[PDB]
Amino acid sequence: QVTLDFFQFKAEAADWFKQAAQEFEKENPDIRININDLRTRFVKDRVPDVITFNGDYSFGTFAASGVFHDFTDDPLVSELNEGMVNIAKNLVQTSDPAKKRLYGLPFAGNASGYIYNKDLFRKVGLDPDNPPQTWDEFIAMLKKFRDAGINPVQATLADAWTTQAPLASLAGTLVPESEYAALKSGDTTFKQIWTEPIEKEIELFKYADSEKGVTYQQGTQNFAKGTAAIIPLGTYAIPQITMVNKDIDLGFAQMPATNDASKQILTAGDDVILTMGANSRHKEQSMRFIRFLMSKKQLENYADAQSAITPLKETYFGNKALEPVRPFFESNRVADFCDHYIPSSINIGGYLQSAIMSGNVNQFIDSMQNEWNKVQA
Numbered sequence: 001q002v003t004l005d006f007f008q009f010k011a012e013a014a015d016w017f018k019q020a021a022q023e024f025e026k027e028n029p030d031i032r033i034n035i036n037d038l039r040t041r042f043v044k045d046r047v048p049d050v051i052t053f054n055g056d057y058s059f060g061t062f063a064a065s066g067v068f069h070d071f072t073d074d075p076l077v078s079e080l081n082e083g084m085v086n087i088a089k090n091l092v093q094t095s096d097p098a099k100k101r102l103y104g105l106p107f108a109g110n111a112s113g114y115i116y117n118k119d120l121f122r123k124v125g126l127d128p129d130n131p132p133q134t135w136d137e138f139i140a141m142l143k144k145f146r147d148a149g150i151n152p153v154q155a156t157l158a159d160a161w162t163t164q165a166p167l168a169s170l171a172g173t174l175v176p177e178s179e180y181a182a183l184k185s186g187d188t189t190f191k192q193i194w195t196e197p198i199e200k201e202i203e204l205f206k207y208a209d210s211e212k213g214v215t216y217q218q219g220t221q222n223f224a225k226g227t228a229a230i231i232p233l234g235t236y237a238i239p240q241i242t243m244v245n246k247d248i249d250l251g252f253a254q255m256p257a258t259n260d261a262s263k264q265i266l267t268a269g270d271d272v273i274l275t276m277g278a279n280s281r282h283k284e285q286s287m288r289f290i291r292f293l294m295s296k297k298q299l300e301n302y303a304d305a306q307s308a309i310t311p312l313k314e315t316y317f318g319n320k321a322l323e324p325v326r327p328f329f330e331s332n333r334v335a336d337f338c339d340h341y342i343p344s345s346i347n348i349g350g351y352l353q354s355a356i357m358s359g360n361v362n363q364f365i366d367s368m369q370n371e372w373n374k375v376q377a
């Protein structure tokens with residue numbers, strides 16, 4: 001007796017949500033679900049009933065502008081990982097602490113680091129269950145693959161956004177989140193906090209010895225076919241790899257940013273936030289679909305399919321490839337993505353892509369500072 005509009009952001013999970021929506025429809029014939037500029041689509045009169053969104057700055061801006069249903073105090077929230085809930089709350093782009101409310105439910109977590117080929121690790125005598133603990137050991141590992149005739153790093157520089165992954169992996173350890181508050185008030189600068197992360201990202205891609213200029217898809221295809229030791233993307237890329245080669249033996253590791261082995265941090269965020277249009281007129285029916293998606297069976301099936309981390313208090317890891325980072329989650333040694341502090345209007349991806357190709361660190365830093373200053377004032 002209603003048809004819901006479902007906006008589903010994630011290309012890599014398109015099939016999973018299509019099948020879940022169909023399953024719900026068969027069990028609830030009165031509720032049909034139709035799946036598909038963002039400011040245009042989210043206009044109040046036509047806002048989607050059910051929404052998935054990546055948990056980043058854009059989520060936070062739409063949350064602050066009232067596009068999304070306010071889930072604060074919803075009975076469902078008590079079943080969820082408090083850290084992941086607080087991540088969602090802290091994304092709200094507001095200077096008012098009381099406005100840091102919950103505008104979606106964490107549905108799946110990710111981590112940023114690198115995906116590595118365990119068979120190639122074994123090939124050159126490395127322990128596939130215990131990846132490098134320091135920057136020097138990480139670089140030594142890459143040099144080891146190069147010297148053994150193996151392409152150490154599969155870059156994907158044709159798609160600018162992928163260059164943001166190593167930056168966030170490295171910054172997670174090098175740059176406390178508190179620095180971005182200081183950055184906003186002018187009490188620090190990009191030169192002071194991001195010079196070292198960009199320098200190390202440039203050093204990383206020194207070891208992209210083959211096919212560095214390919215697309216996201218080409219890169220994960222190459223890696224699936226065994227042509228590189230690591231691909232420095234987050235957990236979200238794992239299903240893109242395994243779909244090409246289903247029994248590839250993968251690990252996922254934290255990328256250690258310094259030679260301080262006792263102070264390493266894992267960048268991790270809410271990969272998928274599930275929410276409702278605030279001005280939607282079918283909230284009762286939408287919530288039924290959302291409660292279905294947020295059930296343990298669906299969450300863990302999604303996690304298995306997408307190599308993700310469930311949002312329930314008792315965390316489930318969807319792929320044994322994630323075991324090397326389990327310690328970071330258990331100990332709460334995690335950090336926000338640094339680009340969750342960067343306004344969407346700033347084309348950081350383009351700037352980073354350029355900096356990696358030219359090696360011009362100072363132009364990246366000054367461009368970011370220029371763009372930032374104009375936004376903040």
Ligand SMILES: OC[C@H]1O[C@H](OC[C@H]2O[C@H](O[C@H]3[C@H](O)[C@@H](O)[C@H](O)O[C@@H]3CO)[C@H](O)[C@@H](O)[C@@H]2O)[C@H](O)[C@@H](O)[C@@H]1O
Nearest residue numbers: 010012054055056161164165168236269271337339340
């Ligand atoms: O470090 C990269 C990214 O990690 C998280 O986002 C995970 C997200 O990454 C991809 O989405 C990208 C889209 O494909 C692009 O079209 C868009 O321009 O850029 C985003 C990344 O910003 C995967 O496709 C997607 O499945 C996955 O969920 C962080 O939340 C994000 O801030 C980081 O940029």
Ligand SMILES: [Cl-]
Nearest residue numbers: 080081082313
């Ligand atoms: Cl918890």
Ligand SMILES: [Cl-]
Nearest residue numbers: 315316317318
């Ligand atoms: Cl588990």
Ligand SMILES: [Mg+2]
Nearest residue numbers: 054056057058
């Ligand atoms: Mg985004």
Ligand SMILES: [Mg+2]
Nearest residue numbers: 176177334335
């Ligand atoms: Mg911190």
Ligand SMILES: [Mg+2]
Nearest residue numbers: 243244245246
């Ligand atoms: Mg095939």
Ligand SMILES: [Mg+2]
Nearest residue numbers: 245246247248
């Ligand atoms: Mg195979």
Ligand SMILES: [Mg+2]
Nearest residue numbers: 260261262263
């Ligand atoms: Mg130390």
